[PDB]
Target: Nitric oxide synthase, brain
Amino acid sequence: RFLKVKNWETEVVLTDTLHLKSTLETGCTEYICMGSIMHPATKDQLFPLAKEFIDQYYSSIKRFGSKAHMERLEEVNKEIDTTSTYQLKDTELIYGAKHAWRNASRCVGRIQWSKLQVFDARDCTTAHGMFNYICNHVKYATNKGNLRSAITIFPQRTDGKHDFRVWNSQLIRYAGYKQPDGSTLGDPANVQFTEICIQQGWKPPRGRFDVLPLLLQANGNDPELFQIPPELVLEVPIRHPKFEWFKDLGLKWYGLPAVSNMLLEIGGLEFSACPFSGWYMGTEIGVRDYCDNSRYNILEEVAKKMNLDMRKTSSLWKDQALVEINIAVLYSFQSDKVTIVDHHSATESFIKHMENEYRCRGGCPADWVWIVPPMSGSITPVFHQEMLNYRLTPSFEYQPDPWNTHVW
Amino acid sequence: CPRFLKVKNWETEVVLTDTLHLKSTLETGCTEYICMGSIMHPDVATKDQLFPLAKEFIDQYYSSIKRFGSKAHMERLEEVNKEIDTTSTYQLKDTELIYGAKHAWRNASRCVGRIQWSKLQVFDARDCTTAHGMFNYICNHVKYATNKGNLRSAITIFPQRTDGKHDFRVWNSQLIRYAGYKQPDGSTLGDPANVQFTEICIQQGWKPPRGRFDVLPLLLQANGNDPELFQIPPELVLEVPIRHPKFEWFKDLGLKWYGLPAVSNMLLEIGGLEFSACPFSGWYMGTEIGVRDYCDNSRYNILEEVAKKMNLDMRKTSSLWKDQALVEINIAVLYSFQSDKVTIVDHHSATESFIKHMENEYRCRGGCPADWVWIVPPMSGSITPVFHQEMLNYRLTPSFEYQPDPWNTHVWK
Ligand code: HEM
Ligand code: HEM
Ligand SMILES: Cc1cc(N)nc(CCc2cc(F)cc(CC[C@H]3CCCN3)c2)c1
Ligand SMILES: Cc1cc(N)nc(CCc2cc(F)cc(CC[C@H]3CCCN3)c2)c1
Ligand SMILES: C[C@H](O)[C@H](O)[C@H]1CNc2nc(N)[nH]c(=O)c2N1
Ligand SMILES: C[C@H](O)[C@H](O)[C@H]1CNc2nc(N)[nH]c(=O)c2N1
Ligand SMILES: [Zn+2]
Model:
C-alpha cells in the first residue's frame, strides 16, 4: 500500500511508494516498535542478491533488460558458480557506494549523496597498503579545510577468516586514558581502544588531544599500528565570538569525521573495511563529544565561567552552556574556513532532500530518532516531519568489533 | 515473538529486560519491513467481541488485587457475562473504573509524567445526563485539579458509548485553551493552533473578545445531543504572567499562560468499554509551553521578537540565535510558574524521574512501554537521560486512544 507522511508544521503530505522495495527487516513487528533500539554467505544466497543489485543498477542507467544487462547477469552467475563469489565492476562499485549513503536512513547529510568520491582499494593486500590508501583518503577529503565526501573500499569478505578491518571506529579520534585517581583524561568513549593501542606498542603522550594511531588489519592477519602524518590531520582550536575566556579552556577538535567501523553491503558482497568521511554538523562535536556525561563533560566548566546558577536544574544552566559551546564550535570552524554545517541548515537541507527523493524516487527512508538533532529539536523542521524507516540495499551496516572475533 | 527483549542505556550501560511486551494487545502500525514510530496517528463492539475483552480486563484487575481465581473473581466474570448477554454491554464497578483509568495512564507510552500514575484522582461522572451536568462536573474537576496552584492529577469519566449515536463528547481538545482568530489579511491573533475550534465556537454563538489570550468556552455534548456552550468561570482559570529573572523587558511582551494542562479529546478504553468523554489533567512540563506553545512557527512564534530584544545576530543561523532565545523563554516560563507557586516541572527533572520510573516498572512489572519520539523533550534532547535510553513501544490496555473530531462525525439535530 502507498503510505503518506505529513509535515505538521507545513501541512505538506508526501506519498511513499519506495518502501515496497525493501526486504531486510527493521526489527519492529505489528505489536512492538523498536525504533529507538540502536541495533535490533553461500552461492545459494548470493546470486539472488547479486541479481537484484545488478537489476537495479541497469535499471538506474535505463538499460534494464539490455544485452549489457543480460550478459552481466550470466557473467555474475558463472562467476559465483565457479568461485563462490563475484567481483563488482568499477561502475557498480561507485553506484553501490553512493546508494548505500543514499539509503542510510540515519544520515541527515544525504542531500550530498551523489557527490561521493569513491576510492577503489580492492587491490590492497597488506596493512601498509591500507595505511597508504587511508592517508590518500584523509589528504583528499581534507582538501585544506574545503572538505569533500569520500569512501575508500578495501577487499570484500571472502571466508570470514581473511577480513580487512580498520580497528579504529573513526580514522581520526582522540585517545582516552583511565586515570589512577578514577576519572578519564582525553576522550572517555575511546578508553578501551586507547588501551588496545598501548597494549600493541603505542607510546601514548598522555595528553588531552592525542590523535590515536591507525590499527589496521589486512586479510585476517594481526593488525598493525601506523601514525597518520600530522600535517594530514586538520584541527580547529575552539574559541568563542564573545567570551574571550573560551580559548583558555584549551579545547580543539579535528576537522574530518570519518567512520571506519561499518560494513558496506553491495549485491550480497560485504566490504568489512570501507572508511567514509564527510564534514561535521556542529552538534556532533558541541552537544555530544563535549557534553555527554560519558564524554568530555565540560558543561559544568563552561557554566562556571558563565557564572550561571547551577544549584537547581530549572535555571536551565546546562541548556545555556550547551548553546554557547555550539556557537563557539561553529564560529571556530567557520573562522578557519573548515567545512561545517549547523543543525538548522542541515535539517533544512534534509527536508529539501526528502522532497527531492519523494519526487524522483517515491520515498526516502529516514530515522527520526537519529535525524532530529540532539539539541533544539522542535525549532528544526525535521522534528515536525513524519518519516518512514525501512531498509533498502546497498547499505551500511554495523558489524562486531574486531577485538571480539580476531584469533591472534 | 521472543520471551525476553533487552533495552540498553547507552550513557549508563544499564540493560533492562522486557517481558511485558508479551501482553501487547493492539497494533503499533509498524511491520517487519517498515517502522512508523514517528507517525503521529498510525458503530460499537458486538457481544462476541466484548466477552473476551471484558474477561481479559477482569482477570487483570483481580490479578492486581491478588484475588485471581477467587470466588469473587469467578462471580464477577459470570455477572459480566450475563450482563453482556442480555444487554450487549456491561457496567464497571467503581473499583474497576478507578483501576482501569489509572492503568490507562500507566500504559500511555507517550507520557513522561507516568511516575505519578497511581495518584490519579478519578471522578465518576457516569450518572451525567445533560451538558449542563457535564459543565458542573468539569468545573469541579478544574477547581479540584488546580488547587490554588498546587496541581493534582485528575480524570472525570462520563458515560461510556452505547450505540455510537449517544456519545458524550467534550468538543474542546483541552479544557483550557486560548482562542485563535484568522484575520482577513492572513495574520492570526491569539493561538494559531485553535483557529478551527474558535470558528466553531463563534458559529455556535460565542461572542469572541478577539484578544491575544481569550479562554475558549467549553463545547459540551451529552447523550449524542447537539453540543452546548458554557463559559468557564474565570476565577477557576489559574494563569501565570511570564516574566524573566534577568530581562526586565520580558514582561513587556505581555505573555501569560494557563496553569492546568487538561486533555479532553481522547477515548478511554477499559475492558472493551469506550469512554469518549474522559478529560484528564496533570501539571505542565516547562517545555510544553516554552518550546512548543511559544516557539513553534505555527504557534505564538515569539522567537524573533525575543531575539530582537536580546539583540542577537539574526542573519546567520550559525549564530544559533534561535537556540539562544529558546533557552531564555524556557527560563522565563519555569521562573514565572515557580514564583507564582504553580506546579511545573523542568525537562531535566521530569526525564530523570521518568528513567527512575521506567527502571522500577521493568523491575516490578516486567516492562514500560515508551515512545522515545514523544518522551525526549523538544529542546536540549541529549543532555537529558531519556535520549540515551532505548525504549520499547507497544500498546497495553486499558489505554487512552485518539478518536475523530466530533464536528466531523456529529449528526446535527
Ligand atoms: C557530507 C556530510 C555529512 C554530514 C553533515 C552527515 C551527517 C550525519 C549525522 C549528523 C549523522 C548522525 C551521527 C551520529 O549521531 O552518530 C550521520 C549518520 C550517518 N551517516 Fe552521514 N553525514 C555526512 C556524510 C556521510 C557520508 C559521506 C556517508 C557514507 C558514504 C554517510 C553515512 C552515514 C551513516 C551510515 C550514518 C549512520 C551511522 C550509524 O548508524 O551509526 N554520511 N550523518
Ligand atoms: C501529572 C503530570 C503530567 C505530566 C508532567 C505529563 C507530561 C506529559 C507530556 C510532556 C506529554 C507530551 C505532551 C505533548 O507533547 O503533547 C504527555 C503526553 C500524554 N500524557 Fe502525560 N503528563 C502528566 C499527566 C498525565 C495524566 C494525569 C494523564 C492521564 C490520566 C496523562 C496521559 C498522557 C497521554 C495519554 C499522553 C499522550 C497524548 C497524545 O498522544 O497526544 N498524562 N504527558
Ligand atoms: C561521514 C560522517 C559525517 C558526519 N558529520 N557524521 C557522521 C556520523 C558518525 C560520526 C562520526 C564522527 F566523527 C563524529 C560523530 C559525532 C556523533 C555525536 C553523537 C555521539 C558523539 N558525538 C558521528 C559520519
Ligand atoms: C495531562 C497532561 C499533562 C501535561 N503536562 N501534558 C499533557 C499533554 C497534552 C497537552 C495538553 C496541553 F494543554 C498542552 C500540551 C503541550 C504539548 C505541546 C504540543 C502542542 C503544543 N505543546 C500538551 C497532558
Ligand atoms: C513528526 C513527529 O512525529 C511529530 O513532530 C511529533 C514528534 N514528537 C513529539 N513529541 C511530543 N512530546 N509532542 C509532539 O507533539 C511531538 N510531535
Ligand atoms: C537510545 C537511542 O536510540 C540512542 O541514544 C540514539 C538516540 N538518537 C541518536 N541520534 C543521533 N544522531 N546519534 C545517536 O547516537 C543517537 N543515539
Ligand atoms: Zn517501529
